[PDB]
Design a protein around this nucleic acid. Structure first.
Ligand code: GTP
Ligand code: ZN
Lengths: 69, 49, 82, 80, 75, 750, 246, 29
RNA sequence: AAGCAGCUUUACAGAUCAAUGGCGGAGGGAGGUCAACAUCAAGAACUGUGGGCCUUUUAUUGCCUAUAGAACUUAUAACGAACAUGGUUCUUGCCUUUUACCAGAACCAUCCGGGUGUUGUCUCCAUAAACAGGUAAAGCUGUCCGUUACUGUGGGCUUGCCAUUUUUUGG
């Protein structure tokens, strides 16, 4: 019923934390009522970059920190 | 106005109500609105002129 | 509304702990807790079950993988119960 | 360890509950709040983990528990 | 705000190559195009290739993708 | 003889909440919301705080049976004896309450009853300087007056949040006898005026912007409150939000549908009327007139409450207040409105910057608090302090800077402070002081030991290091909304009681902020205040609480500022610096009276008012109302601040009647200069005096703008009073909608 | 009949409702409580002996405290009584050399704002500054108007998603916005103390002051000398009784 | 105006002589 | 807010006709121009219980805390939505001395009365309420007696309802 109010959290370099103790880097380009996450891709978790913009199903995300200081 | 009030008060009341409706529950013109306002004012004093 | 969602909304600002399904026990201030429990933390220290300890600025959690949250004992007294 | 002829969780509120969880942990302590999802907000929570023996005992206090992580709850005795 | 709804519409517009990670599906990536759409994550991808990752090319054809298994949807 | 105040901690009222929990959550900077409720005269805002206080506390001892019924309003924050017998609020008096949202997120709210009488509005400015959010309580039967317009404009100009408790709905339903369609058009007219006088911000009961109330009758309600109490079970729980956003407006409802246009054969009421007002109209009319044995069935079936056996045998006004306190069962939705209106990040960073210097931030180790005013609270004197950073304790050494000295040290901050220790700290309760050891960030509190080392407002700060006072921000001298104009001249009757009166005036210059006390030559004391009721409350405070001596006071007098209106026919030098004088433009003096480096000033003056370039580049400084223009650069800038201090000392006390000089521009044409500074400042003031008197002088008269509410057939009588008093003109006669009143926005000299 | 139907059975008794039990405490006759039709009938029959002054703002210069200020300041009010000066007061600062004469200070100013317009007041009670502007509609048309209508003195006002069909408003069971007692109950609701309520205790027959209403108002119009002297002297007795709580 | 009680002119409801429903004078003295 | 599950209730159909356990009972209701005792002008101000702390011996004072209660009047402050009278002293008037006065103040009083609590008495209407200990008072307690503690009909609601990411229909 409640939508995520990340509207002052937009365009942040996010360290995601997903299934498998893995991490995803991405700037916060857009979201919606499911909290699916559009993010511009970066070096993903010796290290590699795949994708251009990713739509993230939120059930993958264990947590996410904002490295944007 | 005054005469109307004296004789057919109910009728006058009805008329007033109608006017009010026109003012509020209808997209009236500016001039029309002004006229309505004037009428209301007159009613308040009961035809001073 | 759900009573623990209210009690998490009433703990917004104190130092709460957060055990997750990956075991990543976070601890710090609370910022947000919606009806669907998006939990946000400032001044948060992180402790893993493996012994990994980190510190970070501000974190978001999507609530689908939260085990439990340790509320402080300050909210036991008042006011949502009686 | 006793009980009355109880019907549902709300009439047995504040009691000394043992709570079984999916992750091999047993939470013992009193209750203060529930929900539709059996979201127990335990009053004086003590967490019991068994690393492979010895019951790793942990003091928590007042904890909101998300209900999907819960397996089943046990009623022990009266409070106070 | 630009939605992931309209971002999957932009994936429909573009059909650029795809590197999907999958939720509790470790050594399988799905590559190809993104065409479908639902109010849920129901989509479709034809001529899909399931790639295990360094952490070969396994034979696979079409996929109707029922979205209970998704970590990434990228293009 | 002075207050109603509970000194005893065994006789403070118990709360439903726990006050120890209230302090225990007070450390959180984002919970505590400061509400300074400001209003017009007699808006019910004190009565609004009665609802919150009676909801919070278990048993107030001051509630008699006339209150527990609900006959006489429990004016609980009106504790001064002047506030008792005048029937007004005269000083800032609020409370600290825990208050729950509809989500039951309970927060500490520090209320502040701004006095709403228009000659008290300086202290309302205190409440505007103290508050994150403001409940602008608005009469229905008077509507948006000019005072409402200025409170809106000033709360926008202080970067403070906006909520409107539209009070007095029973005066629609019972005083004005209005039908629901006409009262709905009345509320449309009020909210349309509100959304006109606010710049780009829509307020509507669709949002949580506007709360409705009639606070004599025990209730207030948001539409979110009313839907979430009573339509929460008839509607499935996913459809609440887009229902509450279809209540207010021209939305209609027959059976399940929602057309914006009305229907054909049923012609019925809008959704707002039929879902909000029409049950509320039926509540009022059935609590008054219906037989009692049917009211229990209606309030049990519909509103799910029970009338007790004591509640059956009440009287119509307390029975109706008890019915409304069962239906609108508390004041929760008001607090949910205050919660959903104010955000900390988007408003607080500019609200901490308007009443200070706009800077980056402060460290959280150092302390930074705004001492708003001393208060003559119960017992001794306290000091109303909002902590913007840090943590105060009892016995904390802290430095105090009176804000009159806050500009000049700010210049020294561009590029020593009396540190009085805190004696005691208590929460600003109402008629009780709850002593608290620790006051946190964002918590309005009262402090004893500070009230000596300053006069009106202070910047209370503790610094721990050397470089952390470099980035410190000082608070401005608090912009009171009306200048003190109404003058009395004061002298004690016996000359031997002269020092005590001085001490009394010291207390007054602390207690009442807007009064300014000028000590003249003859031993007389010019006392300047905002108006008449301000002055006789001031003089009761002299003659009965502070001095207890007998006073000779003069008549009503006025500041009579001296000014210019024409060319000066002579540029005559004076020796003991030949300077002319020109009048300011009317638009320019208006733009300068709202107190609005050099390249921005030169570009604004040259592209707005039509200035010369030589006049725009060559300006010393601005005192308010009057500018100083230049026409050997070392000899100019060698005595820069000496010329400007002589200019200040000249325009503070003019040539004719020792008066301020307001509205004259000085053109320093030339200067003939040869221990020098003692012959520059009085030569500068003689030069300014000659420059004034070479033009033909005018004596300026302050003009009150008048608010008049009069029942319309008593309208020409007002013109009689506007005629028989000279200088008085009616400028705008407004028909206040839906009421028999007229608002006249006239003007009259002071 | 048919206008005084609720009270005629018991208006003219020795004690009106001493025998009945649902209206009165008992035959000791020490408490009373009325139904609103009985109460509205008692309101309507007693037009000549009640307060038609229902506004409290009418007593601006005419309060108890206003008369206390008139007494303490040797000062007359036109409708108000005159007294002795409480203080025998006799004899640079407040001379005509230093006084701007613009507003002649009428004594109504000196009783209205007593600390401002008086050099040297003492024993002065703080006067009740005004009530808000009582906009009470009087409904004085021959029992012809409903209880809720738009009065002739009122200024005019110059301005998918679905739900269940059985989703009703609150109080949708009843159609009538007003009742046959609503026009009477609203008139009762704005009345002063005797009629403002429907229960109370028995204030005795010598303690129900009926003419006290008449000299606490202004004199009506063009009454002669002796009658204005009567109003002034009865106000003088009233204020000498209110100054001294025994 | 006239009387609300009886409709006759001259007096008000507070000084009407008929009971509220919803001439010759001893003079020349 | 129709229904079902649950809980509670009375009319009950039922297990014992036990030992239990809840509720209710261990001498009524309405009152009365009935009186008796309190109590009613104040740190906005009240008591109950308990702890702790200070005198040179812990006594009568006075505080800090914990909880349970504050009936009656009180804010345009007052038991009374009304209002008299008397005394003393001072200051005015009438004056021809006092009483009787004019009329203001200050401090006191006296009268018509009033509220609330408890006790008792009286009137009207009714009617396992049995035994034992005490106080200034009560089912206060012990023994004890009805519906009845284990189901179903009939009422009330304190609740829930009428797989597709964030819990309950699978990592
Ligand atoms: N008829 C009616 N009167 C009301 C209502 N609400 C308040 N009042 C009256 O309005 C008065 C408002 O006075 P307060 O609000 O207590 O004092 P205040 O508003 O702080 O006064 P100021 O500070 O001078 O503005 C109250 O004394 C009430 O008698 C209402 O809803 N209906
Ligand atoms: Zn008549």
């Amino acid at each position: 019923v409640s939508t995520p109010e990340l509207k002052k959290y937009m365009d942040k370099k996010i360290l995601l934390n997903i299934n498998g103790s893995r991490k995803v880097a991405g700037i916060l380009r857009g979201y919606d009522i499911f909290l699916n996450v559009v993010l511009d891709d970066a070096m993903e978790i010796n290290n590699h970059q795949l994708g251009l913009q990713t739509v993230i199903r939120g059930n993958s995300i264990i947590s996410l920190e904002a490295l944007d200081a | 106005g005054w005469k109307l009030a004296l004789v057919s008060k109910k009728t006058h009341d009805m008329i007033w109500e109608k006017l009010r409706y026109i003012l509020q529950t209808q997209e009236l013109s500016s001039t029309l609105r002004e006229s309505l306002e004037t009428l209301f004012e007159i009613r308040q004093k009961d035809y001073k002129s | 509304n759900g009573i623990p969602v209210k009690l998490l909304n009433e703990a917004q600002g104190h130092i709460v702990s957060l055990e997750l399904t990956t075991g990543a026990t976070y601890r710090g201030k609370l910022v947000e807790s919606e009806d669907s429990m998006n939990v946000q933390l400032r001044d948060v220290i992180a402790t893993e079950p493996q012994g990994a300890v980190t510190h970070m600025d501000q974190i978001f959690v999507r609530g689908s993988q939260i085990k439990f949250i340790v509320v402080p004992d300050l909210l036991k007294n008042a006011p949502l119960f009686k | 360890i006793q009980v009355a002829h109880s019907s549902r969780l709300a009439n047995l509120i504040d009691y000394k509950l043992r709570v079984l969880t999916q992750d091999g942990r047993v939470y013992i302590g009193q209750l203060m709040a529930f929900d539709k999802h059996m979201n127990l907000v335990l009053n004086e929570c003590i967490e019991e983990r068994v690393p492979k023996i010895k019951v790793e005992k942990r003091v928590l206090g007042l904890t909101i528990l998300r209900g999907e992580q819960i397996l089943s709850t046990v009623v022990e005795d009266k409070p106070l | 705000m630009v939605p992931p709804i309209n971002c999957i519409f932009n994936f429909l517009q573009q059909q650029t190559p795809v590197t999907i990670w999958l939720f509790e599906q470790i050594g399988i990536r799905i590559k190809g195009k993104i065409v479908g759409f639902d109010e849920f994550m129901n989509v479709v991808i034809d001529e899909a290739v399931e790639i295990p990752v360094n952490s070969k090319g396994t034979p696979l054809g079409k996929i109707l993708l029922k979205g209970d298994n998704i970590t990434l949807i990228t293009s | 003889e002075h207050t109603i105040f509970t000194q005893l901690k065994k006789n403070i009222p118990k709360t439903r909440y726990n006050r120890d929990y209230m302090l225990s959550m007070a450390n959180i900077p984002e919970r505590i919301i400061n509400v300074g409720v400001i209003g017009p005269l007699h808006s019910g805002k004190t009565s609004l705080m009665d609802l919150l206080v009676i909801d919070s506390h278990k048993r107030i001892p001051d509630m008699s049976k006339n209150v527990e019924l609900g006959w006489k309003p429990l004016r609980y924050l009106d504790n001064l004896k002047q506030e008792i017998d005048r029937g007004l609020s005269i000083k800032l008096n609020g409370s600290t309450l825990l208050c729950t949202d509809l989500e039951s997120k309970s927060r500490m709210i520090n209320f502040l009853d701004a006095p709403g009488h228009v000659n008290f509005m300086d202290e309302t400015a205190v409440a505007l300087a103290a508050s994150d959010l403001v409940l602008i309580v608005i009469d229905v039967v008077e509507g948006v007056t000019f005072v409402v317009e200025q409170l809106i404009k000033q709360s926008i100009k202080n970067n403070v949040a906006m909520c409107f408790v539209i009070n007095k709905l029973d005066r629609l339903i019972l005083d004005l006898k209005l039908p629901p369609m006409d009262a709905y058009l009345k509320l449309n007219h009020i909210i349309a005026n509100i959304n006109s006088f606010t710049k780009g911000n829509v307020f509507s009961p669709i949002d949580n912007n506007i709360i409705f109330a009639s606070t004599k009758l025990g209730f207030t309600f948001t539409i979110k409150e009313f839907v979430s109490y009573y339509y929460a079970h008839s509607i499935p729980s996913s459809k609440i939000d887009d229902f509450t956003t279809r209540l207010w407006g021209s939305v209609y409802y027959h059976k399940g549908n929602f057309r914006t246009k009305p229907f054909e054969n049923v012609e019925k009421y809008p959704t707002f009327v039929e879902f909000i007002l029409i049950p509320l109209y039926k509540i009022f009319s059935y609590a008054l007139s219906m037989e009692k044995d049917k009211l229990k069935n209606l309030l049990r079936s519909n509103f799910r409450v029970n009338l007790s056996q004591e509640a059956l045998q009440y009287d119509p006004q307390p029975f109706l207040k008890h019915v409304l306190q069962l239906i609108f069962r508390q004041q929760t939705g008001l607090v949910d409105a205050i919660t959903r209106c104010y955000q900390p990040f988007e408003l607080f960073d500019n609200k901490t910057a308007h009443l200070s210097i706009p800077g980056k931030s402060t460290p959280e180790g150092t302390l930074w608090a705004h001492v708003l005013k001393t208060v003559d609270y119960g017992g001794a004197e306290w000091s109303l302090v909002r902590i913007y950073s840090g943590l105060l304790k009892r016995g904390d050494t802290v430095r105090i800077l009176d804000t009159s000295q806050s500009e000049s040290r700010q210049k020294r901050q561009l590029h020593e402070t009396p540190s009085c220790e805190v004696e005691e700290i208590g929460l600003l309760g109402g008629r009780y002081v709850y002593p608290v050891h620790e006051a946190h960030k964002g918590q309005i509190v009262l402090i004893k030991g500070i009230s000596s080392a300053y006069i009106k407002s202070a910047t209370l700060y503790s610094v721990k290091s050397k470089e952390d006072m470099k980035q410190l921000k000082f608070f401005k001298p608090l912009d009171y909304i009306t200048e003190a104009v109404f003058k009395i001249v004061l002298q004690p009757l016996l000359p031997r009681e002269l020092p005590k009166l001085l001490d009394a005036l010291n207390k007054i210059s602390k207690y009442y902020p807007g009064v300014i006390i000028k000590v003249e030559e003859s031993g007389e004391h010019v006392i300047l205040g905002n108006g008449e009721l301000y002055m006789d409350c001031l003089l009761y405070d002299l003659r009965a609480s502070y001095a207890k001596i007998e006073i000779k006071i003069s008549d009503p007098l006025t500041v009579f500022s001296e000014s210019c209106s024409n060319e000066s026919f002579a540029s005559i030098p004076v020796s003991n610096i030949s300077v002319a004088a020109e009048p300011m433009d009317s638009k320019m003096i208006q733009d300068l009276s709202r107190n609005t480096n050099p390249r921005k000033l030169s570009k604004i003056l040259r592209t707005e008012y039509g200035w010369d370039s030589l006049a725009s580049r060559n300006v010393w400084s601005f005192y308010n109302g009057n500018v100083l223009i230049n026409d050997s650069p070392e000899l100019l800038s060698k005595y820069k601040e000496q010329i400007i201090q002589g200019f200040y000392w000249a325009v503070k006390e003019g040539p004719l009647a020792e008066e301020p000089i307001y509205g004259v521009q000085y053109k320093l044409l030339s200067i003939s200069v040869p221990v020098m500074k003692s012959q520059i400042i009085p030569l500068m003031k003689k030069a300014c005096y000659v420059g004034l008197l070479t033009a033909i002088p005018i004596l300026l008269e302050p003009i009150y703008e008048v608010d008049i509410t009069v029942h319309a057939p008593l309208l020409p009588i007002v013109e009689e009073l506007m005629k028989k008093r000279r200088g008085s003109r009616i400028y705008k006669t407004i028909k206040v909608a839906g009421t028999p009143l007229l608002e006249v926005r006239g003007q009259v000299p002071v | 009949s048919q206008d005084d139907e609720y009270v005629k059975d018991w208006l003219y008794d020795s004690r009106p409702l001493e025998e009945d039990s649902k209206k009165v405490n008992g035959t000791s006759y020490k408490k009373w409580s009325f139904d609103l039709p009985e109460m509205s009938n008692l309101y309507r029959l007693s037009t000549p002996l009640r307060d038609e002054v229902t506004d409290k703002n009418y007593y601006y210069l005419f309060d108890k405290k206003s008369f206390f200020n008139g007494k303490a300041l040797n000062n007359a009010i036109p409708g108000g009584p005159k007294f002795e000066p409480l203080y025998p007061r006799e004899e640079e600062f407040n001379s005509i050399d230093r006084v701007i004469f613009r507003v002649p200070i009428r004594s109504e100013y000196k009783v209205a704002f007593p600390h401002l317009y008086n050099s040297r007041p003492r024993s002065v009670r703080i006067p009740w500054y005004n009530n808000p502007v009582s906009c009470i509609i009087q409904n004085d048309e021959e029992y012809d108007t409903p209880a809720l209508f738009f009065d002739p003195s009122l200024n005019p006002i110059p301005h998918d998603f679905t739900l269940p069909e059985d989703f009703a408003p609150l109080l949708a069971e009843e159609e009538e916005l007003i009742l046959p007692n609503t026009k009477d109950a609203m008139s009762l609701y704005h009345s002063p103390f005797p009629f403002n309520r429907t229960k109370g205790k028995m204030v005795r027959a010598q303690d129900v002051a009926l003419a006290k209403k008449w000299f606490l108002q202004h004199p009506d119009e063009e009454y002669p000398v002796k009658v204005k002297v009567s109003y002034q002297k009865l106000l003088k007795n009233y204020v000498l009784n209110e100054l001294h709580p025994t | 105006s006239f009387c609300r009680n009886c409709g006759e002119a001259g007096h008000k409801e507070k000084d009407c002589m008929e009971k509220p429903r919803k001439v010759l004078v001893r003079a020349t003295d």
